[PDB]
Every structure is written in structure tokens, then in C-alpha cells.
From Swiss-Prot, chain A:
GO function terms (MF aspect): transcription coactivator activity
Organism: Schizosaccharomyces pombe (strain 972 / ATCC 24843) (Fission yeast)
Name of the protein in question: Uncharacterized protein C24C9.04
Gene Ontology cellular component annotations, sorted alphabetically: mediator complex; nucleus
Lineage top rank: taxon: Eukaryota
One GO term (biological process): positive regulation of transcription initiation by RNA polymerase II
Leader sequence residues: none
Swiss-Prot record, chain B:
Gene field: med21
Shown segment, full-protein numbering: 70 to 137 of 138
Protein name per its UniProtKB record: Mediator of RNA polymerase II transcription subunit 21
Record family assignment: Belongs to the Mediator complex subunit 21 family.
Subcellular location per the Swiss-Prot or TrEMBL entry: Nucleus
Quaternary structure (record): Component of the Mediator complex.
Native organism: Schizosaccharomyces pombe (strain 972 / ATCC 24843)
Keywords: Activator, Coiled coil, Nucleus, Transcription, Transcription regulation
């Protein structure tokens, strides 16, 4: 049950809200603490895996320029 | 016994070479004309090869430059 997506964020926020509205000891808080535990372990398993997201965009575009030129040249010889 | 059986293995042949000689001359003429045909078609071949080679060369330099 592990993936670090937006949906489990919204899960977190909904847990927070439900805690606030619930408010000695709390069965909603302990559910919240399980949730933050899960997200903590999900971020601990997390790996940085970073190359520049701006560079990412740029190489998407120049690579796409490559591909378009490839198909242009290929169809050029086939004609 | 082996010599005898080999003598039987021996096929009789005319000592005269006229039949063989004529065969020989036919083969020589034959390979001569086939060699001429090969020569004509071979010159045309090499000309063709030069043409395609030029088109190749254009392709190679163009492709390299443009993609890189």
C-alpha cells in the first residue's frame, strides 16, 4: 500500500480535519498518528533522485525537436 | 586379384584425342564468350556502383551534420 501520490496527501488533510472536529485520549488522534507514521516511513523510503526540473522541461523540448527532425529526414529519403 | 578387378574397373577409351580435343575447343570458346558478357556487364556494374556511392556520400555527411 505504498506510493507517494497526491491522494495520500489529501488523505492526510482529511485525517487532520476529522481530528479537529472530534476534539483525555483520542481514537481519531491515534488514527492521525498512524497516518503521519505512514507518511514518515514513505518519506524515509524516499530517495532524492534529483535532476533539474527546469532542465527536465528543456530536454523534453530539444529531444522533441530531435524526434521531429528524425521523422522529417526519414520521410525525406523515402520520398 | 586386386590387379585383375582394377583391370575390370578400367574403362575402355579411344587412344585418339579428336573427341576430347573438340570438347576442349567448345569449352574454350564457351568460357571466352561468357567472359566477354561478364566484362560488359561488369563495366556497367562499376559505373552504377560509383553513382550510388556518390548518393551515399551526400547522405552520410548531410545526416551527420543535421542531426549533430
Amino acid at each position: 500500500a505504498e506510493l507517494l501520490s497526491q491522494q495520500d496527501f489529501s488523505i492526510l488533510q482529511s485525517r487532520l480535519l476529522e481530528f479537529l472536529a472530534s476534539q483525555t485520549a483520542s481514537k481519531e488522534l491515534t488514527l492521525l498518528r498512524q497516518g503521519i507514521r505512514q507518511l514518515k516511513e514513505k518519506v524515509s523510503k524516499m530517495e532524492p533522485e534529483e535532476m533539474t526540473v527546469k532542465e527536465k522541461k528543456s530536454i523534453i523540448e530539444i529531444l522533441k525537436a530531435r524526434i521531429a527532425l528524425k521523422k522529417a529526414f526519414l520521410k525525406m529519403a523515402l520520398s | 586379384m586386386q590387379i585383375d578387378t582394377l583391370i575390370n574397373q578400367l574403362p575402355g577409351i579411344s587412344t585418339a584425342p579428336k573427341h576430347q580435343l573438340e570438347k576442349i575447343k567448345k569449352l574454350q570458346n564457351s568460357i571466352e564468350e561468357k567472359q566477354l558478357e561478364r566484362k560488359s556487364l561488369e563495366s556497367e556494374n562499376e559505373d552504377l556502383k560509383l553513382q550510388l556511392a556518390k548518393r551515399i556520400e551526400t547522405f552520410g555527411r548531410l545526416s551527420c551534420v543535421l542531426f549533430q
